[PDB]
Amino acid sequence: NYTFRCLQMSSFANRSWSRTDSVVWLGDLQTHRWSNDSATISFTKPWSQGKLSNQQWEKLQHMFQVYRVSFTRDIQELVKMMSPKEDYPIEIQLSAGCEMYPGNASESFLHVAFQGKYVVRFWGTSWQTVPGAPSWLDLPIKVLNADQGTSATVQMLLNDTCPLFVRGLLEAGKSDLEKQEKPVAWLSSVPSRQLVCHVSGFYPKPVWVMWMRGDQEQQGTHRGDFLPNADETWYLQATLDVEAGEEAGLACRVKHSSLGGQDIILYW
Amino acid sequence: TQVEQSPQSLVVRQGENCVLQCNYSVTPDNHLRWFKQDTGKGLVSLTVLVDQKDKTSNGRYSATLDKDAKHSTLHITATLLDDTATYICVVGDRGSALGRLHFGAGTQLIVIPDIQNPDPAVYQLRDSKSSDKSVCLFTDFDSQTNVSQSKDSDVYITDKCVLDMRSMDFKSNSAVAWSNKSDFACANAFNNSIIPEDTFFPS
Amino acid sequence: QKTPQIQVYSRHPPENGKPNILNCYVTQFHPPHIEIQMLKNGKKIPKVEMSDMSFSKDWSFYILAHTEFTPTETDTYACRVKHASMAEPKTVYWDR
């Protein structure tokens, strides 16, 4: 049950200067990378090519190679078309890919954001605006939908290519996706006193962290956000508010899939 | 240039077939279009090729497109006189108004008309208002007859010209000669010209 | 425009005199143009590695900066960020 994401970010500072960078995620692991400086798409995993042959990848990369150059000049022309309604700087983001389900089931998406706000999607056989989008976008939508060749290609990428590519990507990447990295915990106290239980280096993301006195769970436990490490593991800290002098007897218990029933209990 | 055409110039007889090449480096290539342009006239669209490997036809015109080879040919079957025109290749880089059109310099086609019954003659024609002023008309000569320029600077000779009486299915070549001089005759108007040995001079 | 959120944390349990990796996680910012510095005692660290910039489902940008460091009782580590949304650069100091 994984989500495949192609994240494109494009910045247009003025009429001339323009930049487009992309990253590809399968779940929470990066598979591809495409810097503006690079003519080619880079693999960040050994298995990023999936079950595609070299001829299949070259043909697919070339399509995107043409797209980046085309998209860049397209936007610039669309700005000219709407002037002076819209102007630089312009930020355009694309979130494309497909969500995988048990068996041969999937659902594909292609979402477009303009100035940090979701406005356009490809749905069915055409581009369309979503609820909340400005009306001026109806002309760009009308212009993009005129391009039958693009429409047929995008349909093929969403309906056929994405599901097939990721389905083969899960086979070649089974080893990395199902890896089990053990968490390591440590404790600290910050005056305000607040006890902090740091948990770092665990994979996958699902983890259970709670402050406890013996067999009693403490209700005041506040989990932070999941923070990433450089080595593609996760970091999380849980805070508990206590009166000074009541630290004794408290312990942090950590449950994770890698430990295998051997929960880390850290006493203060 | 991103769009190149071959051949540059082309001379062909009536009824003959010809093929015109168009090679390009335009990226990307959405569609390819062939125009016909008569000498100093508009751009008449003949056909549009849109598919990876496409084939189109329009009466006596037929065309192909290979987008892997970035190459297109335009075939003209059984050439007629009216085919005498420049033929232009055009590539559009988008499937919409966002596209830029990339034009070829063109291929110039000249079709030589078939003269059914040659009857070469030199006639004298007179001005409707002035009796004294006159012109000489060399007409009804076959295709392979060259009309040379005048040896005298005061005498003027026009180049070959073929007209079509479409009501009668009749075509004939023609050339006009005149001079500012008083003592000027039509019999001596085409001395410095390789004219047929059976030319008619009226008595 | 959206102001960035900065979180400074270590990869391994911090102890004096032992080599480690320090992380700076910058999130929730727009536009994507950012300047991230990792400082030791106020001075810039030259070998600072940067992950590729990505964004979440809410379209907000995020980026991970990390560098090798050895914590001591005396040294001060921080993460400095310049963004268009802020008039001043925001500096967040590391606390164990």
Next chain:
Amino acid sequence: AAVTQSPRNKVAVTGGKVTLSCNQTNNHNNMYWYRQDTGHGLRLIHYSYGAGSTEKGDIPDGYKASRPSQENFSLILELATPSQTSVYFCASGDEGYTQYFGPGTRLLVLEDLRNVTPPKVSLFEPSKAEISHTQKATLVCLATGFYPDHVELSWWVNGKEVHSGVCTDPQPLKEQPALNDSRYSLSSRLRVSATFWQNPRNHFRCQVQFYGLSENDEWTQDRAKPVTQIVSAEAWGRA
């Protein structure tokens, strides 16, 4: 989807203001200006995505565009140069890739208008020898002594234009090749059946549309002002 251009032909002087316009009633948002030169395909100068919008093309230098309305798109030459001698095509289109082209505009920019002269048109009546030998009658029109070579010769029978049996010299003829500013000559032929020419009710006319000076262009010579005009020669049929 029709697109008209005005003017269709213009003779201009260096430094003069030239306005080339094109009209389109198709409700198309987008309009485009091209120029055509020998040894080149059409090249984009300026284009528009709607009223008030003007965008630089590939070769915008020396040109200004104007889109006052959806219908009209003008190419303006504020300071004309001889290098702007070309055939100018206007085009329009909606969201689709198709661009619908106008008929074209011939522009000639001269250094001086001192030599501009309208033609003298003469019509020459068919030879009686031709009539009795071929059963056909050829009329010959002759335009002489004009400069520059921007002329449109047309044949008219009974107030209506005829194209059948008509051929005109591909290029005009230099009257004095030795001179750089030589005046031009041009011939044309209309061939009809003898029985058609023998009709005293058929009115034959050759007209030459000469393009020269405008009413705004100043003239400091003793001779008549060589303005854009029609010069014609005429004859009736006869037994």
